[PDB]
Amino acid sequence: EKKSINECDLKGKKVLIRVDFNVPVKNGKITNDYRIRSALPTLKKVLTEGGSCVLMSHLGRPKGIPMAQAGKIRSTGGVPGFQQKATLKPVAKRLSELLLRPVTFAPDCLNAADVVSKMSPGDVVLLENVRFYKEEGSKKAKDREAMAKILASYGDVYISDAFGTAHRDSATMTGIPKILGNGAAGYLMEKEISYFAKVLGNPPRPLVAIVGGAKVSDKIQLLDNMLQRIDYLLIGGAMAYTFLKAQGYSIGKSKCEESKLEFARSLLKKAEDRKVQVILPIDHVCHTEFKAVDSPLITEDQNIPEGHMALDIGPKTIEKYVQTIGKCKSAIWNGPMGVFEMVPYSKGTFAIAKAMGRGTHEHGLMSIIGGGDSASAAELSGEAKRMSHVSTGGGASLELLEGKTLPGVTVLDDK
Ligand SMILES: Nc1ncnc2c1ncn2[C@@H]1O[C@H](COP(=O)(O)OP(=O)(O)C(F)(F)CCCC(F)(F)P(=O)(O)O)[C@@H](O)[C@H]1O
DSSP: OBOBGGGSOOTTOEEEEEEOOOOOEETTEESOOHHHHHHHHHHHHHHHTTOEEEEEOOOSOOOOBOGGGHHHHHHTTOOTTOOGGGOSHHHHHHHHHHHTSOOEEESOTTSOHHHHHTOOTTOEEEEOOGGGBGGGGOSSHHHHHHHHHHHHTTOSEEEEEOGGGTTSOOIIIIIHHHHHTOOEEOHHHHHHHHHHHHHHSOOOSSEEEEEOSSOSGGGHHHHHHHTTTOSEEEEOTTHHHHHHHHHTOOOTTOOOOGGGHHHHHHHHHHHHHTTOEEEOOSSEEEESSSSOOSSOEEOSSSOOOTTOEEEEEOHHHHHHHHHHHTTOSEEEEESOSSOTTSGGGOHHHHHHHHHHHHHHHHHOOEEEEOSHHHHHHHHHTTOTTTSSEEOSOHHHHHHHHTTOOOHHHHTSOBO
């Protein structure tokens, strides 16, 4: 429905592409270039059609500085809002290595008129982190419009390929296409829009929703919209403990939301009424503190020892969840099953990714993972390629599933 890069005239065009180059960096070295690799097909398409690329992206969460202060800063020769930890310079080098062509780095995204003017078809320029400027994500349209005006002057056509930031207005996601008068979806964005439209339409049944994460409160709108569309609901992460506590199980020192015990009981009641089969953990991996240990305690059932906090779903739960996924034709997953950040509490999350990938590879299951650590698990274990779709935006994918429209999608042209 939305116009894609394949429908754009690109020959001789200077193409502004909002990419997702938010890669993890440590001591100045990229520790995972997966996102850069995923951006290649969109860039290759522009180059193949005879255009040039002016790439825009953010890295980390820099403080940012107001545009007004930029003038002073530039006179001193400095870069406005610069922060070594969040510079895109190493990303430019890695991109060049992957594309096997030069990539000119423009150290200030709002002061690149000259380098941009000298660009020829086939060139690739990566502007410095757009979040070095406060107006990039400002709540004021005028703030975003001012920054976007400068960026829009750097090109002819706009391509959006950073779904993870599409759920919020920003100079780069919504300002530019507005000012420019055109905008289309890159290959990653195109796939995101398609798959979520599929899941909210009439996906193949049975459909199971696997929901995890740290809080039930963060997933209530998801449940509000999805309960009437699914057959199974598998709950994991700390979200599960509020439910288990509400039902009457001992949860020890596990993370929970006392303010949501009533909600949990009402939800379980609603699910039964709608005949949705809800499955909560039947065992847990726990420890006496929020730290990694080689041989964490594994419970025999739903009950958690006093003095222990559950940090991942246990072996029996994994078995049950995997078996349930095996009965479905569609599976949507949002939120990790445990503390994925720590190796001994990552098994549950890896297991769901394994079941989903196998389901698709061997039976055609429509598997969609909504970003975050759940997507990371799939990526690290090589299951991402076997999945129907692994989203790059946790927050954005959840909002679509809540039934909300995304500013970054709406702003694009229709085909
Ligand atoms: N047993 C347990 N005890 C305590 N904590 C537990 C737990 N099990 C899981 N957790 C914690 O819950 C967190 C993830 O929950 P979340 O709701 O923020 O994630 P999400 O739905 O993946 C998301 F989509 F919101 C993630 C957003 C991703 C992003 F911001 F990067 P985006 O840019 O892609 O939007 C993790 O930090 C994890 O350690």
